[PDB]
Ligand binder design. Structure first.
Ligand SMILES: CCC1=C(C)/C(=C/C2=NC(=C\c3[nH]c(/C=C4\NC(=O)[C@H](C)[C@H]4CC)c(C)c3CCC(=O)O)/C(CCC(=O)O)=C2C)NC1=O
Ligand SMILES: CCC1=C(C)/C(=C/C2=NC(=C\c3[nH]c(/C=C4\NC(=O)[C@H](C)[C@H]4CC)c(C)c3CCC(=O)O)/C(CCC(=O)O)=C2C)NC1=O
Ligand SMILES: CCC1=C(C)/C(=C/C2=NC(=C\c3[nH]c(/C=C4\NC(=O)[C@H](C)[C@H]4CC)c(C)c3CCC(=O)O)/C(CCC(=O)O)=C2C)NC1=O
Ligand SMILES: CCC1=C(C)/C(=C/C2=NC(=C\c3[nH]c(/C=C4\NC(=O)[C@H](C)[C@H]4CC)c(C)c3CCC(=O)O)/C(CCC(=O)O)=C2C)NC1=O
Ligand SMILES: CCC1=C(C)/C(=C/C2=NC(=C\c3[nH]c(/C=C4\NC(=O)[C@H](C)[C@H]4CC)c(C)c3CCC(=O)O)/C(CCC(=O)O)=C2C)NC1=O
Ligand SMILES: CCC1=C(C)/C(=C/C2=NC(=C\c3[nH]c(/C=C4\NC(=O)[C@H](C)[C@H]4CC)c(C)c3CCC(=O)O)/C(CCC(=O)O)=C2C)NC1=O
Ligand SMILES: CCC1=C(C)/C(=C/C2=NC(=C\c3[nH]c(/C=C4\NC(=O)[C@H](C)[C@H]4CC)c(C)c3CCC(=O)O)/C(CCC(=O)O)=C2C)NC1=O
Lengths: 162, 98, 160, 160, 162, 162, 160, 162, 160, 162, 162
């Protein structure tokens, strides 16, 4: 759970050195992208309900068998669990986008999730497809400049689950 | 004495009497815990208007004196420990209080 | 940092960033350039700050470098100045982060019992960091000086 | 409030306010003039905003005022518009406060239970507060419209 | 607890009223003093140990019986508890000054304090004397206007205990 | 708690006597009424939300002051707390009807409630009027006999709050 | 009773009784007449059951009334029979209640501590409860005997 | 019942101290505002009946259900008791303003008032509205400064009731 | 105070303050400044008054300090002079208040029972107060001493 | 009230039995102790004001805060109230001692005293100290045998307050 | 809590002086009984169950109505609670004997005992009789010399209840 600022602080503290000019430039980049990051996070917080709506609808449209009996989501319990998983994934992707670093995904999302799904038998392919469904839509609402930023975090979640 | 002042001198005398009195109380009680706890924070109270080295010398002097009157090895070592707790607490508070 | 604390606070209630939290992050990222200026100015003049920081520390407390003191000896005085360098670097890290959480995570949590193992007097630490604050705030302008000195006063209070 | 939030955050771990907390309070009190201007504009225009928002809500969702609907009747339409007045007042409160705390403590805790006890459809309330956001941000300038929209949008998400 | 803004919000919420000209006057008045309040709070945070030390010195000089045997400051343990209570009072006076309202002083400090002290045997009058010593110390370090403002809250604490 | 059978068992245990004709008559009376009690309990469980809705609408129509600014039920939270109290009153009246005894209403509802409302500032007269409204609404749904039986426990709650 | 158990189970969960629970009370109150007849039969025959149970116990366990025995003597034997009378009354109470709750509240909680403070052997209690089981189930019909035998079995297990 | 002078006397008595410069400053401030207080009190005393008439008219116009059958102010005796209560609030606000302290409001007015109204069934929100009606009516007669002064006591009554 | 007394008298009759109380309050607030100066005069020279009054009291009643008297001894004499200090402070309180309400509330209600428990002779208190009055009227100039005397007079009448 | 003889009478009345050997033994015990009780009662009646004087002096010497400004006993009124309470305690302890039962202490003194003191703000610790002071003062006057008898009633009052 | 040693130390510490002749006399008296008291405590610790058995037998033989229907000890649960209370009294009397002080009895038994026994309906006189019965049994078990020391604290408990 570290942002870009804390990331450079740690990478410079571990070696015991003071900040360099390159460090200041890398800080400048994040300070410049901060406003668009905040705007994207605000739009995402605005529309999170809608992206959940459409993500669940599209996931259960392209794969029919989940909602039908015998499916990985066949129950109101399992349906709520799946939509809650999308909600948490999207909120944490927004968190990572604000922080500008993927450490939060490791330390609160991928921390024990992968082997939890392995023991539960959750299909990794369906989860990854849900993540593409979420990001391809969220990119439209957040704009292309914020879309490319959300893309790396959603892809990181996919690769972690994959 | 003259530069130290009358009020600080009264404080110093009552504090020496204080150390001796809690040595007596600890001996009666069977545990030096009151001395230890009341000394685990005393140094920082003392430093600004007192000399810690002077206090350690004074406590060593009372240790030697009290050991003098006992005329028994076990009693001498017991009272020596009950004064060593004062010395040890003062030395332990070289940094701030816990 | 400000962003990290805001994200943690939002995550505590399992919610998104509040309008106030988005606003505080916006204010942090807006003034980040000035924080970079302050950190660069502090970093460029680090060796001075450390050297005369040791100077006022040792003149104000001669007993530390007096025999029987904690800082007696070339090696021990060098470690004294290296600790001052550590804390100046931590202050610059805090300036960049916009808050004191680098100081917390590196050099504050457990500092008392560490310097207890080191016999290091905490009033000496307070005097050293106060000298550092005076010098650093002197090099910087008053508008900078206030926020730079707040971090140093934070460190002094932590050591005290 | 922002100040209250900072003070309780400091009081939780038994310390004086950190430099970051003082900085956020400084930013909050630096923005007081625009906050008062925005709240003054919204209060000045409360009748216009409520009127236009009610019109747009009832046109977009005629079934609310259709027979069998919740807002059917002069008295129930009056109650419907009174709720919009309530939430506009709360939004102005949260604007002067600097955060959504008054909004949440007055009109968000238990609101779902309350509106289920009234047969008031939650999507209707979401549409009403969205229309009222549109009308209100219509009057205000570009910079202020976003920060008012944050409050309205929080309230919409809370009802949703 | 509540600050001045929240106090105005509550006093207009119970009445079911929007902010009128007087409410905006009060809010503007509070916002005017914000920078002064932040400066005073930062100064007192910087000098809290000095204030507590010198105020405790003044109190124990004017009340010698407290530290003598039978007094409620007579041990290092009991003395340390006293100075911790002094730190409590200074910290909460700083909080109240920064908030601009005495609600925190009544809620987190004054409520139940007399009963606690009666149970413990603490002398309330000597505590009030220590608080007045705090006020005398703090005025000089904070300057004229900040001294008036912070003395309001020290007076509130004293009158609550008295 | 205590129910009719348990009440008879207790009153014959205290005196140390075996069951006699009168005790068997009381037990038989409860056993006969049990079927009607169960039907009433199921009806109230199915319609509890509607009963609360109608009783609350009645109360707040008769006394609009309670939900206007300055009223005890003026906020979403205080209103929700009010309807929660009404829900609890209805559920425990149902429990007492099904048990046949008012012990649970004493120990589990009314023991300490009136002092709680005096501390909180809840208008107990309005609460009793709401309980009476609940009685009126419930009687129509349950029919005449179950209405008399449940009105017994509603009146017990109302008089206990007194 | 059964009603009390259902109601407290629902109360501890903050919910109304489920249809299965209401079916429980329905079936329980349906069998009320049989339970009342069984309790009446046991209550009318109390004095004979006590004497036959005492005779069976003492013939099976002569030690208790033997010299040096716990029940040796007229007063101690009378106290033994009085305890048997208590437990027969408790069994009738449990029968009318439809569960062992009266037996558990009046006779089971703390029975081992009680009889330990009274130097009363627990195996003797179990043998007495078995004897009274035999005598009481001798009177009843097969279906009623099967019902009463389980209350006596719970008593025997509690005493052991 | 303590005014500003008595409050200073008490805060100096509990400390056992003689009067110093700060106490003289506080009493001088009270003596400075005394003329405004006396003029406002005389104006309100001369126009008390008019203020009550205007405020009762405004309240019953805004809430006509009070004086209609089924309202708490529907009978001659209840209307008389309502205007009698308004006379209490006005008179005691005048006393508190003249004294300069709100002690008489915690001391003779608001102690147990919520319980009394809740027992009587008196509407609390409507009474707060009537207290405001008196506040706006009185401000016009007393002028800007005296209205600012009396507003704190009227708002004190409103907040204590609410 | 004068204001508190007028308010209490008005409340007893359930009426607003008439012109009589109002203009007496106006007179009281007009004369507050000279009352403050008079209180300053007695406050600045309090120790002189206490010592002179104690001397005069012991001259008039030497039996108080004589063996067997209540003021015998240095400590009891100190307590005597401390009581005189208490009453001087109360008299200054009465002067600033303009009424004898502080004197009565702090030092007149229950004074008989308190001095009876301490076995203090009330007449000796009377000469003590008379000596204090003589000294204070000595220091004050002209009409000022007049009103001060009144307070002392009341105190004497209160104690006799 | 109730004393030892009435206690035996009442228990045998509730049990509905004539006196047995145990009852006569209890009565003989009371008759044996009665003469000592009368001597102690006369002694305390003679020296009531004295005992109160030394006990109050001892308490206010051990806890000088009470009588000093800001102390609960600091006023002529509050000091006299303290002495009156101590006189009540002594008189009712004497009644209980002469009776041989503590029922009068429960009814007349202890039933309501804790709540009274908690509402008034009286320190209960200091009051227990005052009772202990009266105990040790009166023990020296009544004599060791009577001191043992009076100590149980002073302890009863102290435990009732604590 | 306290013991005899802590009481002496605090008595001479609040004054600020060394142990005088009376202090050494009290310490010698406390130390002289120490081995006898330790032997008694060991005998009671090894044999608490017996003492409870004969003490309860004596109590319930003297007052049969306690263990018959309608008695406070008529149930297996209430009988067990009775003997458990007897074990509390024995164990805390032993603690107090070893401590040489009654502070533990005030702190950990008598505080809340009257409220408990009055809420539960437990007869206080019968509890006093049970404590007396434990007194005779313990005195018979541990010898007369330790019997007096233990009877001091048993009498303290008995006078605390009555
Ligand atoms: C905050 C980071 C985090 C998350 C989000 C998380 C999710 C999570 N999902 C779970 C079950 C589940 N998870 C899912 C969702 C899966 N099944 C399909 O719908 C999809 C392919 C896929 C959605 C991504 C479902 C349907 C269940 C319940 C089905 C079952 O019982 O196996 C569980 C097991 C415990 C429980 O459900 O209470 C967890 C912990 N764990 C974490 O530490
Ligand atoms: C037995 C356990 C114990 C001790 C001894 C103790 C000492 C003690 N001395 C104090 C004051 C003081 N103490 C001293 C110095 C004296 N101090 C001694 O160790 C020296 C022998 C000597 C001087 C060489 C002085 C000068 C003061 C005045 C206040 C100050 O130092 O700031 C204080 C602060 C309270 C006050 O100002 O009166 C304590 C707590 N407290 C304890 O609980
Ligand atoms: C970034 C977080 C961090 C800190 C702060 C830190 C402090 C630190 N200082 C040390 C030595 C030292 N540090 C000092 C300096 C102190 N003594 C003087 O009196 C002054 C009052 C004061 C400096 C102003 C001294 C004298 C030593 C030598 C002590 C010894 O070697 O035993 C050591 C022992 C290990 C070593 O020297 O390599 C540590 C761990 N270490 C950390 O990882
Ligand atoms: C300050 C916080 C607060 C709020 C928000 C609040 C809302 C509120 N709305 C109410 C009724 C109502 N509320 C509405 C509004 C809804 N109707 C349509 O569906 C729309 C979607 C929607 C409006 C946009 C309507 C129509 C009623 C009348 C219902 C009735 O009286 O039967 C009531 C009950 C009033 C009564 O006793 O008659 C409350 C308390 N109360 C509060 O204390
Ligand atoms: C309703 C719940 C309840 C129960 C059950 C109960 C039992 C009970 N049995 C008792 C004595 C006794 N109980 C027995 C019975 C034993 N003798 C043999 O050993 C057998 C193993 C066994 C009977 C089968 C005997 C012999 C005594 C007399 C012993 C004595 O003198 O203490 C006593 C002592 C007081 C008295 O005799 O009246 C109680 C309280 N009390 C209750 O409140
Ligand atoms: C603020 C109002 C107030 C007053 C006035 C007051 C009187 C007062 N007088 C006291 C004792 C005393 N007062 C006196 C004064 C007497 N000496 C001569 O006899 C004269 C006749 C007379 C004075 C002219 C003396 C000698 C004592 C000491 C008695 C003793 O120690 O037993 C004490 C006890 C002090 C303590 O226990 O530490 C009080 C409280 N208390 C109050 O709260
Ligand atoms: C060490 C401090 C301490 C004490 C003193 C204490 C007493 C105590 N006894 C209790 C019950 C009881 N106590 C008794 C006592 C007996 N009744 C008979 O009549 C006899 C006269 C008498 C003893 C000889 C009884 C019968 C009960 C059961 C009351 C009930 O459950 O209704 C309870 C209620 C909790 C429970 O039932 O376990 C307490 C707290 N508990 C403590 O933690």
């Amino acid at each position: 759970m570290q942002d870009a600022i804390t990331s450079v602080i740690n990478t410079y503290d571990v070696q015991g050195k003071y900040f360099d000019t390159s460090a200041f430039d890398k800080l400048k980049a994040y300070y410049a992208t901060g406003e668009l990051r905040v705007r994207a996070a605000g739009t995402i917080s605005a529309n999170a309900a809608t992206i959940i709506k459409e993500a669940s609808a599209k996931l259960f449209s392209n794969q029919p068998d989940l909602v039908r009996p015998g499916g990985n989501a066949y129950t109101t319990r399992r349906y709520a669990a799946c939509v809650r998983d999308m909600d948490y994934f999207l909120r944490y992707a927004t968190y990572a986008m604000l922080a500008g670093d993927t450490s939060i995904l490791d330390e609160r999302v991928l921390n024990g999730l992968k082997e939890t799904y392995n023991s539960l038998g959750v299909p990794i392919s369906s989860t990854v497809q849900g993540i593409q469904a979420m990001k391809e839509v969220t990119g439209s609402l957040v704009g292309s400049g914020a879309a490319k930023e959300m893309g790396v975090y959603f892809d990181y979640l996919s690769s972690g689950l994959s | 004495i003259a530069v130290y002042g009358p009020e600080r001198m009264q404080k110093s005398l009552r504090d020496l009497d204080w150390f001796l009195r809690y040595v007596n109380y600890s001996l009666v009680a069977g545990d030096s815990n009151m001395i230890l706890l009341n000394c685990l924070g005393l140094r920082e109270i003392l430093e600004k208007a007192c000399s810690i080295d002077a206090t350690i010398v004074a406590v060593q002097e009372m240790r030697r004196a009290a050991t003098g009157y006992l005329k028994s090895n076990d009693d001498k070592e017991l009272v020596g420990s009950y004064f060593d707790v004062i010395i040890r607490s003062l030395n332990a508070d070289k940094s701030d209080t816990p | 940092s400000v962003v990290t604390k805001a994200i943690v606070s939002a995550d505590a209630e399992a919610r998104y960033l509040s309008p106030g939290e988005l606003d505080r992050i916006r204010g942090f990222v807006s003034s980040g350039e000035r924080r970079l200026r302050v950190a660069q100015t502090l970093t460029e003049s680090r060796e001075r700050i450390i050297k005369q920081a040791g100077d006022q520390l040792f003149q104000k407390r001669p007993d530390l470098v007096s025999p029987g003191g904690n800082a007696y000896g070339a090696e021990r005085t060098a470690s004294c100045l290296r600790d001052l360098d550590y804390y100046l670097r931590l202050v610059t890290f805090g300036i960049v982060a916009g808050d004191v959480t680098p100081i917390e995570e590196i050099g504050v949590i457990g500092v008392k019992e560490m310097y207890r193992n080191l016999e290091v007097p905490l009033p000496g630490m307070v005097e050293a960091v106060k000298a550092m604050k005076s010098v650093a705030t002197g090099l910087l302008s008053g508008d900078d000086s206030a926020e730079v000195g707040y971090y140093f006063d934070y460190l002094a209070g932590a050591l005290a």
